[PDB]
Amino acid sequence: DPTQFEERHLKFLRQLGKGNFGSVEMCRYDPLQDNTGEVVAVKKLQHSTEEHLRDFEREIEILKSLQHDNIVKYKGVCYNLKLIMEFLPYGSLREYLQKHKERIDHIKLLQYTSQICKGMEYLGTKRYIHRDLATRNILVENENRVKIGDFGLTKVLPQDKEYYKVKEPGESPIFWYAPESLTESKFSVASDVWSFGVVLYELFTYIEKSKSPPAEFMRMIGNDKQGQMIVFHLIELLKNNGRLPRPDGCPDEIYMIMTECWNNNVNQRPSFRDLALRVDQIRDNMAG
Numbered sequence: 001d002p003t004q005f006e007e008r009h010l011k012f013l014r015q016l017g018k019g020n021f022g023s024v025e026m027c028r029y030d031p032l033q034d035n036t037g038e039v040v041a042v043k044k045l046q047h048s049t050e051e052h053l054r055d056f057e058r059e060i061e062i063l064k065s066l067q068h069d070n071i072v073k074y075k076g077v078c079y080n081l082k083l084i085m086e087f088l089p090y091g092s093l094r095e096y097l098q099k100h101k102e103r104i105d106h107i108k109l110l111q112y113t114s115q116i117c118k119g120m121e122y123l124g125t126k127r128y129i130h131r132d133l134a135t136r137n138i139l140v141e142n143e144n145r146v147k148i149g150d151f152g153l154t155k156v157l158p159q160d161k162e163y164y165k166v167k168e169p170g171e172s173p174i175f176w177y178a179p180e181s182l183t184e185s186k187f188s189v190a191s192d193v194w195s196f197g198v199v200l201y202e203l204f205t206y207i208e209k210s211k212s213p214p215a216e217f218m219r220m221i222g223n224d225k226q227g228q229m230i231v232f233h234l235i236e237l238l239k240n241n242g243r244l245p246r247p248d249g250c251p252d253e254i255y256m257i258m259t260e261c262w263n264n265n266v267n268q269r270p271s272f273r274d275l276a277l278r279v280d281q282i283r284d285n286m287a288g
């Protein structure tokens with residue numbers, strides 16, 4: 001029923017991103033062919049396996065079930081299955097921050113952080129595990145609002161368990177992964193909290209390249225480090241309390257929140273509700 005979009009009326013404008021077996025394009029949906037249609041974002045499989053099709057169908061059903069100010073809006077589907085979403089004109093929070101860092105102060109990062117926590121808490125409410133929290137997957141709707149913007153790796157918890165075990169082919173964002181995701185392939189609300197700690201780290205480094213999680217972890221492990229052993233060495237590092245450093249300029253109270261997200265003890269990480277509470281309290285206090 002979703003105002004199904006006809007493919008012939010979708011006009012390609014440019015690519016927005018890639019995965020991951022996915023890609024997102026900016027298109028103009030122009031059914032009257034008079035150049036008055038709205039611009040939308042279109043996600044499609046970059047190589048349409050039938051297994052990837054199944055995952056994509058599931059991704060679509062997930063986004064469709066989500067309605068929240070901080071979750072990118074589902075608009076419909078076009079079928080060659082394509083997912084149609086609203087286009088957020090500021091693009092990803094990653095690129096936004098890279099290009100506007102002199103305009104975006106700490107209070108503003110905490111506003112975004114708070115919105116990300118609210119979005120994630122809403123997911124947890126549906127027993128959805130995001131599994132890929134990272135600033136390149138957060139979108140900027142306007143200067144005052146961000147949204148979680150991709151759900152390609154999102155899973156629903158089994159009914160009887162608080163974690164979902166999954167091992168995917170090819171490449172993982174290991175430098176955002178909780179220890180138990182690396183060692184046991186276990187993903188849970190708590191591993192999303194671990195990765196949220198890494199998102200907060202990213203925000204406060206202002207996406208400085210030499211400071212990215214991969215660069216810092218690689219540097220702590222040693223870049224004689226030869227790729228298969230990398231995960232093994234990363235595991236050992238985390239187990240011995242190796243951690244991303246406090247970013248330049250970051251207050252101790254904000255770093256403390258990161259470090260608490262990065263607890264090896266899965267059950268000792270903060271909830272997203274407590275995170276929002278704490279972040280909002282630091283905001284109110286930075287007011288004056």
Ligand SMILES: N#CCC(=O)N1CCC[C@@H](n2cnc3cnc4[nH]ccc4c32)C1
Nearest residue numbers: 017018019022023024041087088091150
């Ligand atoms: N496949 C895939 C990932 C991808 O292409 N991304 C990551 C998630 C955000 C994507 N993106 C980049 N700029 C965007 C603007 N609006 C968007 N609406 C939905 C997605 C979306 C936008 C890019």
